[PDB]
Each structure stands twice: as structure tokens, then as C-alpha cells.
């Protein structure tokens, strides 16, 4: 009672009893700043008119799926080195360079598919968008199996960001680039689940 305790289980009963008399939760009112966490940007919206309609977006996504099925037929039938940024750039784009034939993309493993995408993004930041570039990106995207690594998700968002910026330079929809850019943006944004980047018109 008022003694102290002599065995532990007693003490513990003692402490337990005490702890049920305590309030369970306790809020203390106080009387009176923050760092910032950088965060990478969304896509740049499309100039007025340049935005593709939902049915077109859904048309390609569907279409792109089917394409990726085909890609696994060849992939059953089985080049610069994986780390060769320079030779991969040359190989694909050239000066010309090699197109993306199933022959070739079907021989590339995923870690390479990924690398290469990186290289063509680093080329794309500092050079202009050709149609040749266009095919490659689209191919490497058709060779990317999922579920994607986080690192790979970040890559293709970077790439889609880089497309939307370039789309602001354009001055007529007649530009060759516009369709290609809208596509890649749509595929990352809808096929690869990054719908924060999507062009909801």
C-alpha cells in the first residue's frame, strides 16, 4: 500500500496502475521559419490549340500497348558497349546512324534500354529534336518492360518535361515536331502512369 514493493511483478502492477491514472493523451498549448524542399517541375502546358484531344491520346495508348506485344515476339528470337555514352549517341543518330530495327532493340537488355534512353535525353537537352530521335525514344519506350524502377520513371518524366518546353518554341502546328512531342508526352503521361504530366485539355 504505502510500503514499497519487493518483487518486480508487484512493481509493475504498481507502475501499471499509475499509468492508468495518467491522462492518455496530453496537448500543451504554446505561444509564439521553415526550410524549402525543392521539387521538380510539371510539364509546360500546350499553347492554345496545340493540345491533343482525349480520344487521340486514348487511341495511341491502346495502339502502343499492341505494339509492345509484338515487341515480345522478336524478343523471343535471342552495338556499342552499354557504358559508351558517345558511341550510343553516334550509333543511333550518327552525324547518318542506325535506325531502331527489332533486330537490334530486341537484343538489348533492360539495363541498357534504360542507359540509352538517358544518353538520348542528354543529347536532346543540348541538340534539336529530329524524327530519327523520335523513333528511337518511341522504340526504347516500347522495349521498356514494367514494373519500372523509380530511376526509370524519373528518366522518362525528365524526357517528357524536355518535350513540353521544346513545344513552346514552335510557331505553327504544321511543325514536324509537335505530333512527335505530343506523343511522347502522352505515352509517359498515360501509358507509364505519370498522369500529373498529362495534357488534360
Amino acid at each position: 500500500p504505502s510500503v514499497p514493493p519487493r518483487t518486480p511483478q508487484e512493481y509493475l502492477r504498481r507502475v501499471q496502475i499509475e499509468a492508468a491514472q495518467c491522462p492518455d493523451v496530453v496537448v500543451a498549448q504554446i505561444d509564439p521559419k521553415q526550410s524549402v524542399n525543392i521539387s521538380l517541375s510539371g510539364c509546360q502546358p500546350a499553347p492554345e490549340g496545340y493540345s491533343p484531344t482525349l480520344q487521340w491520346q486514348q487511341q495511341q495508348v491502346a495502339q502502343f500497348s499492341t505494339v509492345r506485344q509484338n515487341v515480345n515476339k522478336h524478343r523471343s528470337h535471342w552495338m556499342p558497349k552499354s557504358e559508351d555514352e558517345e558511341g550510343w549517341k553516334k550509333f543511333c543518330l550518327g552525324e547518318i546512324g542506325f535506325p531502331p530495327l527489332l533486330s537490334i532493340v530486341s537484343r538489348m537488355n533492360q539495363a541498357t534500354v534504360t542507359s540509352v534512353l538517358e544518353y538520348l535525353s542528354n543529347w536532346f537537352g543540348e541538340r534539336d529534336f529530329t524524327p530519327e530521335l523520335g523513333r528511337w525514344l518511341y522504340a526504347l519506350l516500347a522495349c521498356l518492360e514494367k514494373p519500372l524502377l523509380p530511376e526509370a520513371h524519373s528518366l522518362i518524366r525528365q524526357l517528357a518535361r524536355r518535350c513540353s518546353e521544346v513545344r513552346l518554341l514552335v510557331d505553327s502546328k504544321d511543325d514536324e515536331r509537335v505530333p512527335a512531342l505530343n506523343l511522347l508526352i502522352c505515352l509517359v503521361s498515360r501509358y507509364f502512369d505519370q498522369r500529373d504530366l498529362a495534357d488534360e485539355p
Binding site: 491533343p52 487521340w56 487511341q59 495511341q60 495502339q63 502502343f64 505494339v67 509484338n70 515487341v71 535506325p99 531502331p100 530495327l101 527489332l102 533486330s103 532493340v105 524524327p131 523520335g134 523513333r135 518511341y138 522504340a139 516500347a142 509537335v178 505530333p179 512527335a180 505530343n182 506523343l183
Partner: peptide, 17 residues
């Protein structure tokens, strides 16, 4: 069709209307 991809791409671009 070893160039199915290059073809698919062009069809897809092209299909913009």
C-alpha cells in the same frame, strides 16, 4: 517486318488530326 517499330512510330505521328 524487322522495321515494325520505325513503321509504328510513323503511323502514330501521321495519325495526328
Amino acid at each position: 517486318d524487322d522495321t515494325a517499330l520505325i513503321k509504328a512510330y510513323d503511323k502514330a505521328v501521321a495519325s495526328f488530326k
